[PDB]
Amino acid sequence: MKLQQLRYIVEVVNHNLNVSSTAEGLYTSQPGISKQVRMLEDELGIQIFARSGKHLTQVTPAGQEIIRIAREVLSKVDAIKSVAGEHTWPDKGSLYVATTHTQARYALPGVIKGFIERYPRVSLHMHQGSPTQIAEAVSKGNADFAIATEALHLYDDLVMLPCYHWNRSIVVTPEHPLATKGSVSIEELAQYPLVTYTFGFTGRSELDTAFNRAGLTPRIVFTATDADVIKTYVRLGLGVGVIASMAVDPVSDPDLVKLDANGIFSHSTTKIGFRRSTFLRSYMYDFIQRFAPHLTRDVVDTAVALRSNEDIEAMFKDIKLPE
Amino acid sequence: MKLQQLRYIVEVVNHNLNVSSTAEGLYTSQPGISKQVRMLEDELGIQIFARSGKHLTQVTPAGQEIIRIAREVLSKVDAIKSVAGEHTWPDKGSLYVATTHTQARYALPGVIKGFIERYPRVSLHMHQGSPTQIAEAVSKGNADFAIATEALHLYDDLVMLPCYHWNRSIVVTPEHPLATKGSVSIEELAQYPLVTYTFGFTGRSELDTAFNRAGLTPRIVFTATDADVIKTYVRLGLGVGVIASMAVDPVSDPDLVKLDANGIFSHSTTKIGFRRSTFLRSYMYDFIQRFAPHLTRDVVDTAVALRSNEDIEAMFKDIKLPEK
Amino acid sequence: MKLQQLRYIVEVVNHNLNVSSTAEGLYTSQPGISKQVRMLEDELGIQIFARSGKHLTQVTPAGQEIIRIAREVLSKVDAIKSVAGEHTWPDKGSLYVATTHTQARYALPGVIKGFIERYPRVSLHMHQGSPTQIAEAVSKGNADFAIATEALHLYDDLVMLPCYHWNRSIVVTPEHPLATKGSVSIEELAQYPLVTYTFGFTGRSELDTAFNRAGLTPRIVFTATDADVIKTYVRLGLGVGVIASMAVDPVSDPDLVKLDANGIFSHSTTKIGFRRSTFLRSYMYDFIQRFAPHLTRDVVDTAVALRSNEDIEAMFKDIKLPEK
Amino acid sequence: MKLQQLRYIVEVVNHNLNVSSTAEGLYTSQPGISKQVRMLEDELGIQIFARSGKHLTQVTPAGQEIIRIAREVLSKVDAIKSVAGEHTWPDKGSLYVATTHTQARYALPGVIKGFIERYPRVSLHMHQGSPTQIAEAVSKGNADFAIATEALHLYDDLVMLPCYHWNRSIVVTPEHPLATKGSVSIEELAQYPLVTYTFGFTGRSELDTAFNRAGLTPRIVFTATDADVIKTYVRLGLGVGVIASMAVDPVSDPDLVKLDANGIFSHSTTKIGFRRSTFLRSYMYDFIQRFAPHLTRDVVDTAVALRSNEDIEAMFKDIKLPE
Ligand SMILES: CC(=O)N[C@@H](CO)C(=O)O
Ligand SMILES: CC(=O)N[C@@H](CO)C(=O)O
Ligand SMILES: CC(=O)N[C@@H](CO)C(=O)O
Ligand SMILES: CC(=O)N[C@@H](CO)C(=O)O
């Protein structure tokens, strides 16, 4: 059978079985129509229309099922012509970044907003994880980039690109013995129960270093992997939170008290990282310099071309990285 | 657009993008098909296939949508001719079923005999195969029904009707250690070389689940599609078969012991099923009911109007189906 | 054989066969560990690891068995110390839970507050992650409990206790086409770019099933592990989010509309679970009951004595769990 | 803690809390035992044994749980020493053959019985399928060999190794108008309803050829992919079966009647096939010559070395292949 026959029998019913009126609507002749209809009935060996004279009188019981399915065939062919084009698919590439939650929510949404404007057909996949985990996916071949924010010793066999420096705040409820006070100390911090990151104390971290040096041992009551849970947890009593300062601002967090701890702990450096055997696509270079605006193609190319991350550190020695 | 163009592109996929093979298949020539393909591409404004040189390498994203719809169009066309058949002469036509060797050999022979006796002018065609091939046969228009025994996620796009639940046996030669000793644990079973289906272990079968639960890995020496090959292999040494309990006959299977493996592996469910676009002729409703007594005509049509195989399951929630 | 040797080989696997990384991790030196490893190999008469030059390339079949057992041995050792803790001072210790961002942010804060109030000398450690990482944390001894929201086949080796059923929402900016129009079909949804979890589409999730049923393929522009990232992304243009309905607040989520996607995707089930080898301290039973009221102590111990998570399910068959 | 401590406390309970008797059984001294026990209790900070004098009096409530788990630790360590060796695993290789059911049940069980004796650590995987399917897996990379028994036009881009020739029988029930008769004909075959293979009639097959040439059209009532179902189906009435002669023998099939059809249809040739880009392992060469004993390594090497299957056909031109 042909699509055309199907069109003709549906149309003959739209026009109330008037074949002459069918012809005018379809820009053809009554013999044209009638030839196709009769050919279809011959092919199928069943009458789709009852006739009395030359005249169509009605659709036969069987014809009614054929016309119903025929209407479905037509509708589907339209649907074929409606199938959207190759530019609706994001198959121009895929970028897999392993990073932190604060980085993805307070840092990168400003970058993501850009990368997607430029590359609307590259798909973007932000995996989160402990410093340990972040570093493992890059090695394993599961991730393109690694945005290490600390414990950068784990990101060992990877290019290391300094992006900025960050500082740990102390967070407390408004009513807390620290909420009204000006500056606070290491000794009188360790006095309180501590709420911080799950990987915060490992035996080599900075939080640790500041307690081992002071011969103090802190009382940890709650840890989480994500800062937003540390903060939600501090909607309670006596605990003291120890997270990134960028994880708290008084606009979103008016129910909390952000409080300098800049002179209490050493500072950290969020680097970006990736395997050396990875062809840097355009969208890759793009993400890097969207995150850190000084990591322009040339800087990166100049950076990777070297032999050791010591040499990149050497390279940025006397340049004030952002804060 | 033309039906022939939709046939051609569907057949190209059916033939694994091998256009020389397609052309032999439809008794025309490669240039005939390519011209038709390219015109469709031109007409739609969409490449259906990625290309290399003279080779087709893959169906594109957009091509995939177009092709899916093309498959529906052609199945509708075959429904038109089936409706005419039904009205012209109800007791005359053909039924194609795709299933496994065990279903054919042990669940169907009776059912078939009955049917052929009632419908001597209906030709019946039984394809045997793996879950993947059963799904394939229904997809390429080679089969009206699937009778599927496991891996039911391969049939989410079909209407599938529950038939019965079944369980597996461990089966060995009478010498074998497990014969003499009582019941068998997964830890015990894991220490021997396993004989089972090619789709026995897939990463997500009932056999996988039992082994993942115990944190064990199976030692697989021999697989086959057909439970009957597997059964001949066990005529030797240490190998332990893992197959359906109904593939073994306490009478006509005299050289094999049949150990209770109901407590190692969970049961599977056998379903019979079709594309929603298949016109259900009277002999087809009969075939379903003869295979599965509780699938009366109203039960079927009731089941077809629902949205999901999960909704169909719900229909049968306050019933207990046969165990086999 | 020595405990230290079993620690070492387990840690080598935990560290992805990276022995330099292992050695840094346990504050000793690579030669220390290699010597211990090789001696174990020598003692057992089995290479645990395949090697290349100075590199470990994979764990061998036999090595895999040995390692699985080694993991049990070490968990038993930690059970000994947990029992001593329980008897010496019940209200003092640590609880480690691994779960998703939404569980932490929206199902736990209350539950936690209650617990910390009753047990001020129990430190609580909440790891957030993907189904794969939740399973990983319990396997490497980093977590006492998993609260798993989907992909439950990743936990066949744990005792898992049903908590509640949950469903997903389609979520968009108020401009978006779908806002204005009524209910949404999968065919409609498939025509937009999707925003969902990194484990949203796996080949066997609830999202896959809905799409396979309709014969459609999703256009995935953005994934993230955390429902909250996904929610910030939808502050833009066309992208349509597919996430849990409880990750969205008709109050504190004011820039997003929440479309009924209960009729596109089937529900999932949130379970809480542990290795059978974990000694259940009193505060742990409390944590379970506080999270899931119907998991009383007897219900738990009743559930642990059963053989399967499927048997556990059966316990709850004549009950209807909470929907969230 | 150490395994040794665990051993000591379990053993002290096996010996009914007599430490001196424990020492003799373990070839050590009472101070030896007692040092480890006390060290464990110190590590755990809980008493495993109640004491009255120097004497053990009983296992404490907590000690009873520790000794129970300790017994489980010991048992597991034994289980480690019981883990079977690398020679219990079939990881020396895997062979994926795509063939027919008759071939796998009446032909290859004699070969399989051999291959497994020689290679007990190569796993063997027999996939079955329509001639079409058999040929597709080889191409796709899912199979190592293809044992085509007919429609060898599908096995196009593959090495083709003739193994033997086979002939189609006719099968019927004892009571059938053909059961007592001697020889039968093409015309009076087409008189009956036909039970044969699902791919039997394609438009190029031999069954076809013999009917197109004779200007006859047969009445097909039942097809199956497997011969055993064709035969089981012929436990009925009037149908006539058309399958391989090797698929029927009067020992297994006494309820049937096998009946020459050698002069009614052309003969077929079961070849073995494989991609040219496939390194023939030892177990591969082995299977080929176990199936066809004349396809010895040298024959195969001599066979593949050529350029066209026409040349292999040329090569076997005047050699009587088996039957
Ligand atoms: C800047 C940042 O994201 N810091 C981490 C801490 O490593 C965080 O998740 O807060
Ligand atoms: C009951 C049944 O047919 N089972 C399949 C395997 O799922 C078989 O072929 O034996
Ligand atoms: C209800 C829930 O927690 N769902 C997961 C996804 O399965 C989430 O993180 O949102
Ligand atoms: C020899 C053989 O196996 N022949 C096929 C027919 O192609 C069969 O399955 O009987």
Author numbering:
A (entry chain B), D (entry chain B): 1 to 323
B (entry chain A), C (entry chain A): 1 to 324
Q: Could you give the paper's own sentences about this structure?
A:
The H32 and H3 crystal structures have 2 and 8 molecules in the asymmetric unit respectively. In the H32 crystal form, a crystallographic twofold axis of symmetry generates the CysB tetramer while the asymmetric unit of the H3 crystal form contains two CysB tetramers. There are two protomer types in each tetramer distinguished by the juxtaposition of the DNA binding and the effector binding domains. CysB(1–324) was crystallised in the presence of 10 mM of the inducer N-acetylserine. The ligand is enclosed in the prominent cleft between EBDI and EBDII. It is generally well defined in the electron density maps of all of the subunits across the two crystal forms though the occupancy is lower in the B molecule of the H32 crystal form. The carbonyl oxygen of the N-acetyl group of the ligand accepts hydrogen bonds from the hydroxyl of Thr100 and the amide –NH2 of Gln103. The side chain of the serine forms a charge-dipole interaction with the Glu150 carboxylate and a dipole–dipole interaction with the hydroxyl of Thr149. Meanwhile, the carboxylate of the ligand forms interactions with the phenolic hydroxyl of Tyr197, the aliphatic hydroxyls of Thr100 and Thr102 and an ordered water molecule.
Under conditions of sulphur limitation and in the presence of the inducer, N-acetylserine, CysB binds to cys promoters and activates the transcription of the downstream coding sequences. CysB is a homotetramer of 36 kDa subunits, each comprising a smaller N-terminal DNA binding domain and a C-terminal effector binding domain. CysB is a member of the LysR-type transcriptional regulator (LTTR) family, named after its founding member. To elucidate the subunit arrangement in the tetramer, we determined the crystal structure of intact CysB in complex with N-acetylserine.
